[PDB]
Every structure is written in C-alpha cells, then in structure tokens.
Amino acid sequence: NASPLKHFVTAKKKINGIFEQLGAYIQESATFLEDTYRNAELDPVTTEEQVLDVKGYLSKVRGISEVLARRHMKVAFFGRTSNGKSTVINAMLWDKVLPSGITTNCFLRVEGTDGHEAFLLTEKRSAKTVNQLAHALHQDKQLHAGSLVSVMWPNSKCPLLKDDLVLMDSPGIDVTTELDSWIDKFCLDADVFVLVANSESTLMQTEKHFFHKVSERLSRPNIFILNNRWDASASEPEYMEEVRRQHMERCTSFLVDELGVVDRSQAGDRIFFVSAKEVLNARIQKAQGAEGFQVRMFEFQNFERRFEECISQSAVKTKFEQHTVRAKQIAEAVRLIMDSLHMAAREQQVYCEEMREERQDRTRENLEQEIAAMNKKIEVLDSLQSKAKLLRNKAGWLDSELNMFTHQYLQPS
Secondary structure, eight states: OOOTTHHHHHHHHHHHHHHHHHHHHHHHHHHHHHHHHHOTTSOOSSOHHHHHHHHHHHHHHHHHHHHHTTOOEEEEEEEOGGGTHHHHHHHHHTSOOSOOOOOOSSEEEEEEESSSSOEEEOOOOBOOSHHHHHHHHHHOTTOOTTSEEEEEEETTTOHHHHTTEEEEEOOOOOSSOOOTTHIIIIITTOSEEEEEEETTSOOOHHHHHHHHHHHHHSSSOEEEEEEEOOGGGGTOHHHHHHHHHHHHHHHHIIIIIISOSSOTTTGGGTEEEOOHHHHHHHHHHHHHOOTTHHHHHHHHHHHHHHHHHHHHHHHHHHHSHHHHHHHHHHHHHHHHHHHHHHHHHHHHHHHHHHHHHHHTTSOSTTHHHHHHHHHHHHHHHHHHHHHHHHHHHHHHHHHHHHHHHHHHHOSOO
C-alpha cells in the first residue's frame, strides 16, 4: 500500500483541475457576454458592469490558479539541537541532508526540485556534499537566526519531496532564546509541529511555552512529540521500560490536559520513542548496500506513517478550504448573470413578437421585407436564450463538482 501523502497529492490535482474547468467556463462566458453587448442590432440584454465583473472574475480565477498549483504541506521541527532534531529530518529524507554533528543558528527549509543536484537560497549557491553545505553557511557572516535558508533537494532521491512536502528545521532552542517572533514569521502556514526531545529528561519550559503559543494562535495544530536518544535501552531494557511508561504519561498529560490538542485516545499516535541515529545509519547502509533493534526500527516507520496520515488530511483542509468557497461564490455570480441575461432575452423576444403581430395589421407594401427583419431578430434572441441557458446549467455543474470536493476532502474529521 501507498504513502498517505497521495491524499494531498490527489486532492491538489482535483482542486487544480476544477479551477481549470472554471477558468475555461468564465473565459467562454466573458466571450459570449462581451460579444452580445457589442451587437448593436439588439436592445440591451446585458450591461457593461456584468461584462467587466466577469472579466474581473476571469483575472481573479487565473490568479488563484497560480497560488493553488503551488500549495504544499509543511512540517516544522523544534527543540534542543543536542536531542537530534537534525538527524530526524535526515532519517525521513534517507540522507545526511542537513549539517549535523559539530550546525548553524537559523531556520532551514527543505523542499524538492526536479533538477538532479542541490542548491541553496536566501541567487543559487551550490551544495553538492553535506560538508559543502556546512561551509557555505559557515562563510556567510551575514545570515542570522531570523533569516531563512532553503535547501532545494533533488526529489528523485526522496518520495516525500515529490509528494509536495516541505521540511523546516528551526534553530536549536535554549533557555533565553526568543521564540516569540518564530510563529508569525515562519510557522503560520505549518500543518504539523514536531517537538524533538530526549526521553529521560523533562521538557524545557521554553519548549513548553513555544508549543502553548502555537496552541493558542493556531487552529488545531497537530503536535507530535518525538523522544529521541532511545538506543540507551539496548543495555538497560528493564529500566527503560519503567521510564517509557513514565514519560509517556508526562507527554500525554501535556498534550491532552496542558495543551488540549489531542484527547487521550489519540495520544499514542502522537508520542513516539525512537533513535534517529540508528534509523539514519541503517537507511544510509540500505541504499548503498544492537538489541531491540527491529522494535525501535519499527517505531520510527510507524511514526513516519502516523505523521503522513495526519499531515495529508490536515493540509488539504487548511490550504484549500477558502479557495473552494471562493470558487463556489464566483460560479454563483456568473450563474446569476447568465440567468439575468436568459430572462431579459426572453422578455425582449415577447416584445418583438407583438411588434410582428402589429406589423401584420398595417399596410401591405414591404410587409415581408419588414417581417423578415423582425423574424431574423426574433431568431437571434431565441438563440441567445439557448446559449445563456446552457451557460447557466454548466455553472451548476461546477457547483456540483466543488460540493463533491468539500464532502470528500473538507469534512471536519
């Protein structure tokens, strides 16, 4: 079975698809309206506000097309540098992607590219090897913790990237580090937050404050707790069993009671005990070619899965909700303009028919000349009712199509 990120990858494809259909619908509607308004052999059935309103809708819809086709999922990692925040990301990308061991104090952003080698962004600085990446960051005195650097990584290497996932590494938390600017400047668009901690120590207060600010400011943030450095339990399995259950009770109370972001039932799908160092080494080994190993190796793969389910579900609902509602209300406006035009063309066709009845009450010279002109005009109006009624009904299709999307991908879960 396939990665849960396909849920996001597909829904973006559909919502991108609907907006292409909607753009073509307005383009055609704008064409039909403006040419109807321009024909000066009919009493006005449309006004120039309607034509311009629709031309505005055409521009707006093309504007939303650009932003939608760029939507992506975002996961941010926080914590102390020593707890392995950086190896965790490396483990999920199956590579040493971020400088680790002994790291720079700024925000890092990992996104994929179709090109087959790597570069930096703050221009297009090269970074072929991880030692190269550490130095480009080392030389540049100008960067700082509030700056944002993007690692643009080949997505043929990592399927996470191909599926429109962005990974963001935050600077290592310390006791007086000012996290206060962090959420508004960088994490407002983030779908899941990962606290990478250490199993046997209690969370820093500064860690806790940052994740409470996220709880207050954001709309149901999805918070995972990663307890790293857990390979110590290879040699003291009996003790670490006692310690796991104690820390599991700590993190749950933090998540369920202190923060309120998950009730007790889901808490186990949000708190994990793993060793990213082990997972990293193993996956390095696998591409090229201790005790309790498989159990810890399986927990990381399970956490990876539980995270990809969460991010894909939540990201779709958050990046597309407003754009679906906008499309539905644009389709409604264009549908009423055609509806107004269909009824005005009808009301004028009635007028012309009486004037044809009246003409046949008058003189005989040029009767059929004169009744041809009126019969020509009546046919245009009748044909206008046709195309307008068609344009009305397909706006309902768009309405039916977008409502299907809300039902499938925007239900409150």
